[PDB]
Structures are given as C-alpha cells and as structure tokens.
Design a protein around this motif. Structure first.
Motif, PDB file in Angstrom:
ATOM      1  N   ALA A   1       0.834  -1.197   0.000  1.00 58.39           N
ATOM      2  CA  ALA A   1       0.000   0.000   0.000  1.00 58.39           C
ATOM      3  C   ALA A   1       0.869   1.247   0.000  1.00 58.39           C
ATOM      4  O   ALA A   1       0.544   2.239  -0.634  1.00 58.39           O
ATOM      5  CB  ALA A   1      -0.910  -0.006   1.207  1.00 58.39           C
ATOM      6  N   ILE A   2       2.009   1.171   0.671  1.00 57.88           N
ATOM      7  CA  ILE A   2       2.934   2.297   0.730  1.00 57.88           C
ATOM      8  C   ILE A   2       3.400   2.702  -0.687  1.00 57.88           C
ATOM      9  O   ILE A   2       3.824   3.846  -0.909  1.00 57.88           O
ATOM     10  CB  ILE A   2       4.161   1.968   1.669  1.00 57.88           C
ATOM     11  N   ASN A   3       3.277   1.776  -1.644  1.00 57.77           N
ATOM     12  CA  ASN A   3       3.697   2.011  -3.027  1.00 57.77           C
ATOM     13  C   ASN A   3       2.584   2.171  -4.051  1.00 57.77           C
ATOM     14  O   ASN A   3       2.829   2.091  -5.254  1.00 57.77           O
ATOM     15  CB  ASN A   3       4.630   0.897  -3.474  1.00 57.77           C
ATOM     16  N   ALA A   4       1.367   2.451  -3.608  1.00 58.07           N
ATOM     17  CA  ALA A   4       0.289   2.613  -4.562  1.00 58.07           C
ATOM     18  C   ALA A   4       0.457   4.003  -5.163  1.00 58.07           C
ATOM     19  O   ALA A   4       1.233   4.823  -4.614  1.00 58.07           O
ATOM     20  CB  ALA A   4      -1.033   2.501  -3.871  1.00 58.07           C
TER      21      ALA A   4
ATOM     22  N   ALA B   1       7.108   6.005 -14.748  1.00 56.39           N
ATOM     23  CA  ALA B   1       6.857   4.920 -13.804  1.00 56.39           C
ATOM     24  C   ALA B   1       6.010   3.840 -14.436  1.00 56.39           C
ATOM     25  O   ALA B   1       5.397   4.048 -15.481  1.00 56.39           O
ATOM     26  CB  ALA B   1       6.115   5.464 -12.560  1.00 56.39           C
ATOM     27  N   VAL B   2       5.956   2.685 -13.790  1.00 61.62           N
ATOM     28  CA  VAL B   2       5.096   1.600 -14.279  1.00 61.62           C
ATOM     29  C   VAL B   2       4.174   1.273 -13.121  1.00 61.62           C
ATOM     30  O   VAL B   2       4.592   1.247 -11.979  1.00 61.62           O
ATOM     31  CB  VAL B   2       5.901   0.342 -14.700  1.00 61.62           C
ATOM     32  N   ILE B   3       2.897   1.091 -13.381  1.00 57.07           N
ATOM     33  CA  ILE B   3       1.981   0.705 -12.315  1.00 57.07           C
ATOM     34  C   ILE B   3       1.575  -0.715 -12.671  1.00 57.07           C
ATOM     35  O   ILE B   3       1.026  -0.974 -13.761  1.00 57.07           O
ATOM     36  CB  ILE B   3       0.708   1.566 -12.254  1.00 57.07           C
TER      37      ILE B   3
ATOM     38  N   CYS C   1       3.461   0.841  -7.718  1.00 62.22           N
ATOM     39  CA  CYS C   1       4.384   1.643  -8.490  1.00 62.22           C
ATOM     40  C   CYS C   1       5.724   0.952  -8.535  1.00 62.22           C
ATOM     41  O   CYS C   1       6.271   0.600  -7.481  1.00 62.22           O
ATOM     42  CB  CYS C   1       4.545   3.040  -7.840  1.00 62.22           C
ATOM     43  N   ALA C   2       6.276   0.798  -9.734  1.00 60.69           N
ATOM     44  CA  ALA C   2       7.572   0.146  -9.912  1.00 60.69           C
ATOM     45  C   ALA C   2       8.479   1.012 -10.792  1.00 60.69           C
ATOM     46  O   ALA C   2       8.010   1.772 -11.652  1.00 60.69           O
ATOM     47  CB  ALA C   2       7.389  -1.185 -10.498  1.00 60.69           C
TER      48      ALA C   2
END
Lengths: 72, 72
Positions: free
Chosen positions: A5-8, B41-43, B53-54
């Motif tokens: 979730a920290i990376n949404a 970014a890539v989701i 998010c990557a």
C-alpha cells in the motif's frame, strides 16, 4: 501484498480552474490529504461526472464544500 | 481536448516498490507518461487487484513488462 500500500499511485492536482463553478453543477468533492501531492487541492465531481481540481484558498471553494457538506 | 480536462486530477507514482514481485502474481501494467508527474513509472496490477508503483530503470520491471506483453 501486505505493505504494498505504501507504493500505490497517488492522485493529485497540478492545474486548477480559476473560474468559479456554480454549486448546483457540483455533485460532491474530496480534499487531497496525501502529503505526497505538491499542494492543497479539492477535487470536485460535477453532476455529469467529470472531476475538476480547485484551490481551497479561494473563497468560492470553501463555500462550495460547506454547501456540499449539509447536502444529504 | 476541452479546457476542463487540463484541470483534471492526475495519477502519478511518488514511491517505487523496492522488492521484486513474482511475475505469476502480475495481471497487467500501465506506464505513467503524463507531463505533470515527477518521473516515468510503471503501475503493476496484481492478481489480487493491488496497484503498485515500480521503477522502470530496474531489470525485473522491464522483464515483467515483457512477460505481460508476450501473452495474448
């Protein structure tokens, strides 16, 4: 999954409308609370379901939220 | 595009997942390219519908995109 979730992704407002929008054209709103976004902002959802970013520093915005809050 | 669209909120990535995610847990992806966002970014969307998010500068992310693209 757990802490992912920290990376949404985060939805933010970068451009704002400068024209006041009549309150009868508005359906609801949400104030941006994520600290990740560059600035204070309100996303109004209009009756036709489009979302528009407004500046809560402008008086009409504050009034509009107040109007929408008492509206069931 | 009509004026209101310019004032629409934008979804971006501010945080990048640090841990490699297994490809079997990935359902799809989309790239962020809006000029309003901070960085490319890539989701990734997982099988459990989570959105993460990557960072596209990492090999595993490029590899996961090819794996998702190979399928039809």
């Amino acid at each position: 999954m757990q802490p992912d979730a920290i990376n949404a992704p985060v939805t933010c407002c970068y451009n704002f409308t400068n024209r006041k929008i009549s309150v009868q054209r508005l359906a609801s709103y949400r104030r941006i609370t994520s600290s990740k976004c560059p600035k204070e902002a309100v996303i109004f959802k209009t009756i036709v379901a489009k979302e528009i970013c407004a500046d809560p520093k402008q008086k009409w915005v504050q009034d509009s939220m107040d109007h929408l809050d008492k509206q069931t």
